[PDB]
A = this chain, B = another copy of it.
């Protein structure tokens, strides 16, 4: 996972 946010 690459997650930029919430």
A binding-site residues for B, Cβ under 8 Å: 1-6
The 4 closest A-B pairs by CB, nearest first: A5-B6, A5-B5, A1-B1, A6-B6
A2 contacts B5, C-beta separation under 8 Å: no
For the complex formed by this chain, how many copies does it contain in all?
10
Provide the bound-state CA to CA distance between A4 and B3, in Å.
Answer: 6
- Beyond the given pairs A1-B1, A2-B2, 11 more chain A to chain B contacts, judged by CB atoms under 8 angstroms and listed by A's residue number, are A1-B2, A1-B3, A2-B3, A3-B3, A3-B4, A3-B5, A4-B4, A4-B5, A5-B5, A5-B6, A6-B6
A6 to chain B, nearest CB (A): 5
A3: chain B residues at CB < 8 Å are 1-5
